[PDB]
Short mmCIF file of C-alpha atoms in Angstrom, two decimals:
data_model
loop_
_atom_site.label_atom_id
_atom_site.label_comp_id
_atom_site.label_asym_id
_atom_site.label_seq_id
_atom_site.Cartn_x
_atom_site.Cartn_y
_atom_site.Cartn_z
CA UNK A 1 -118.63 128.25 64.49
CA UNK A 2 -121.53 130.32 62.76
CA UNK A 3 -121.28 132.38 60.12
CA UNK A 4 -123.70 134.84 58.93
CA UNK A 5 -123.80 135.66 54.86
CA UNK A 6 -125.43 139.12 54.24
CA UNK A 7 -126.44 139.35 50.27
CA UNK A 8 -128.79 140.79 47.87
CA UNK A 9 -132.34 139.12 47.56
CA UNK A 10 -131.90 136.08 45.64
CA UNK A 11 -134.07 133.18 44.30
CA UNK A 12 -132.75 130.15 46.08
CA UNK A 13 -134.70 126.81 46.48
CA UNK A 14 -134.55 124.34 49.62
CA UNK A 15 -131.66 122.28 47.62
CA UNK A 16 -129.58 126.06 46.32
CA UNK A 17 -129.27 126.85 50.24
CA UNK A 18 -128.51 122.75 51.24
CA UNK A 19 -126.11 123.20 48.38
CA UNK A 20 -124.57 126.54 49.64
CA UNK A 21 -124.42 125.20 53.33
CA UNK A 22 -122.66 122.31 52.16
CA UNK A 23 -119.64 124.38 50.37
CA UNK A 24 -119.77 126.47 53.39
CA UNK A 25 -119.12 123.78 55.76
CA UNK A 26 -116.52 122.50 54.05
CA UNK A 27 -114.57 125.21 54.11
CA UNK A 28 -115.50 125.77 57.83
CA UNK A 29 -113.89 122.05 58.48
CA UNK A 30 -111.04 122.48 56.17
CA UNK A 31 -109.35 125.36 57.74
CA UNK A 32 -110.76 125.51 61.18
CA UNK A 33 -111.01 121.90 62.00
CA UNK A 34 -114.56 122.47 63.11
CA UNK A 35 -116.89 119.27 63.44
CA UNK A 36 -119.93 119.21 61.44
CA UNK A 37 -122.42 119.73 64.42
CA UNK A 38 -120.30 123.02 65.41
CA UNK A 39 -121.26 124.83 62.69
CA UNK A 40 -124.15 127.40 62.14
CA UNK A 41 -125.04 129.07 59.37
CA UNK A 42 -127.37 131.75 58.49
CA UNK A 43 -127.90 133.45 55.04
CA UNK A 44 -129.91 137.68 55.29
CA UNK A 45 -131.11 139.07 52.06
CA UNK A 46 -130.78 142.71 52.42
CA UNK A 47 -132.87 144.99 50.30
CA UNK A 48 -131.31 146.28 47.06
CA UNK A 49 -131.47 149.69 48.52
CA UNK A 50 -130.40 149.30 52.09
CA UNK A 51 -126.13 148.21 51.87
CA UNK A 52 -125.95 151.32 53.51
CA UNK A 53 -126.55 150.01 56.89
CA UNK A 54 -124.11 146.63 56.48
CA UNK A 55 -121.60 148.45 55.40
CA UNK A 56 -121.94 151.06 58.61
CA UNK A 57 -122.30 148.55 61.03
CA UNK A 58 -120.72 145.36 59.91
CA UNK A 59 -118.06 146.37 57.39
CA UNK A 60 -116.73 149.82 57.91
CA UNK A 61 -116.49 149.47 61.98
CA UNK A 62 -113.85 146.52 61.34
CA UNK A 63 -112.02 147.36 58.02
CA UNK A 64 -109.35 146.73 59.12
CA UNK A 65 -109.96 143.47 61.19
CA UNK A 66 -111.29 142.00 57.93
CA UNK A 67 -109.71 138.90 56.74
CA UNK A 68 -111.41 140.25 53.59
CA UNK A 69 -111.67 143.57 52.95
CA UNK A 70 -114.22 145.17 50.98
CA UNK A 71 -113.52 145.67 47.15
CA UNK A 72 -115.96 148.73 47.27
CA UNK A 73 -115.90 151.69 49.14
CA UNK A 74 -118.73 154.01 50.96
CA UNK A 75 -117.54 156.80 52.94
CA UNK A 76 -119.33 160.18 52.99
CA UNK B 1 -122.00 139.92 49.87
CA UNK B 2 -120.47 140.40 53.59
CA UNK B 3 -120.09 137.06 55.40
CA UNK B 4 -119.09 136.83 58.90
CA UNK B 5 -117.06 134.08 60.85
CA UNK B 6 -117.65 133.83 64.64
CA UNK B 7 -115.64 130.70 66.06
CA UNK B 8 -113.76 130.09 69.65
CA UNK B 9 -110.32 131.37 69.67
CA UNK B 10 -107.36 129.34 67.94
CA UNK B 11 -104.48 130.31 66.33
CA UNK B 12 -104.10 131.53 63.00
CA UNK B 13 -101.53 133.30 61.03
CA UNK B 14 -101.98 135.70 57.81
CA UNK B 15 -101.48 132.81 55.13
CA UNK B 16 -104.02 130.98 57.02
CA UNK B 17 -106.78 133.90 57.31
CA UNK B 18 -106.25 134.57 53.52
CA UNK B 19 -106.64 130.96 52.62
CA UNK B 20 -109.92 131.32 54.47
CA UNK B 21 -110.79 134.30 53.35
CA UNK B 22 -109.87 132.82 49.65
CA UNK B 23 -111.99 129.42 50.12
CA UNK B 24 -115.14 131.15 51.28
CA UNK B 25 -114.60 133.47 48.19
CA UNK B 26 -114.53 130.77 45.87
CA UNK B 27 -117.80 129.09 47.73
CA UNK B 28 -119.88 132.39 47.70
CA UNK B 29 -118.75 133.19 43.96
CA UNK B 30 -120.19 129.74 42.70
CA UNK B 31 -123.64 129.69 44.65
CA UNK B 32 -123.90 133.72 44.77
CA UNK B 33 -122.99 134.44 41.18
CA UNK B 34 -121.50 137.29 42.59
CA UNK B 35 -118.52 139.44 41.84
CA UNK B 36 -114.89 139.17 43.31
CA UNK B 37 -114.23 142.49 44.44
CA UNK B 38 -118.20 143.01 46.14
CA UNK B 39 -116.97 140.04 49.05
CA UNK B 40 -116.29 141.18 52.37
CA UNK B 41 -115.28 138.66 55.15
CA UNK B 42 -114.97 138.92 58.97
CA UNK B 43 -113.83 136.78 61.22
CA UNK B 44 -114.42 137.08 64.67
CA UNK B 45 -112.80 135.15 67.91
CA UNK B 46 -115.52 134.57 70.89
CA UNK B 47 -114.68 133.42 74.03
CA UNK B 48 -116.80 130.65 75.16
CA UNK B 49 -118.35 132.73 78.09
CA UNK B 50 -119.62 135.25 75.48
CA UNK B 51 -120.94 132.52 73.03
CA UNK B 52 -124.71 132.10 75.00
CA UNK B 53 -124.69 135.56 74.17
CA UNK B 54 -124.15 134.90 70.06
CA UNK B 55 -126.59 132.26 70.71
CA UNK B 56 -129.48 134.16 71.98
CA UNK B 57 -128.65 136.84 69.37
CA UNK B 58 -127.86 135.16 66.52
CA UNK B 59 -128.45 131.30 66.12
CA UNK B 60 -131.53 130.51 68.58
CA UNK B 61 -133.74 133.71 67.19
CA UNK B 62 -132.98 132.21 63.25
CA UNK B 63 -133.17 128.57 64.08
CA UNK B 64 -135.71 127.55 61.62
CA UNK B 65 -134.37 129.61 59.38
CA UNK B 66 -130.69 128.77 59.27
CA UNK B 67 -129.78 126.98 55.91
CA UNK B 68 -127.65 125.32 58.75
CA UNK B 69 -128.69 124.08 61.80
CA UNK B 70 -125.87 123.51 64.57
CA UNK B 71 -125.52 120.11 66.08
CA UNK B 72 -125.82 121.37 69.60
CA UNK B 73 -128.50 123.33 71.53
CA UNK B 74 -127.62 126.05 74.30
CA UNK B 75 -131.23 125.89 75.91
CA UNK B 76 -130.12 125.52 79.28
#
């Protein structure tokens, strides 16, 4: 599997994102019986002033789909 | 944050996609010090024709710069 994380600019060392990937794969493993070398992960840091544009094309276009729904809202 | 799930199809019912859904939560609330209600999650099925396509899009453009490198390598 891959999965993309989409977050604020953040200050993360070479062992925060190790450490993040780690507690992502787990999960990955856990509930989707994935094997290690399956998974993919990539981590964007959006500019604080452009969620605009995630929400448009990543979250609002499959609201419904979500397993996750946004707490948030930004519709016109 | 807005994380995004792309694995090969497989079964899964609503108590599974929410225990997901909750696990990632926990994972991105710990590493992202972020809020509860600002997580959105997706979690999209690809066929394995249309994964070369995810690959050239999303994994093989990012490689060096995926907290996570996959185990595998669609190069040919």
């Amino acid at each position: 599997p891959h999965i993309d994380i989409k977050c604020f600019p953040r200050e993360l060392d070479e062992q925060q994102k190790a450490a993040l990937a780690a507690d992502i794969t787990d999960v990955i493993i856990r509930h989707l019986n994935s094997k290690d070398s399956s998974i993919s992960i990539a981590l964007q840091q959006i500019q604080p002033e452009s969620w605009q544009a995630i929400w448009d094309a990543e979250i609002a276009p499959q609201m419904e789909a979500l397993i996750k729904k946004p707490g948030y809202s930004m519709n016109a």
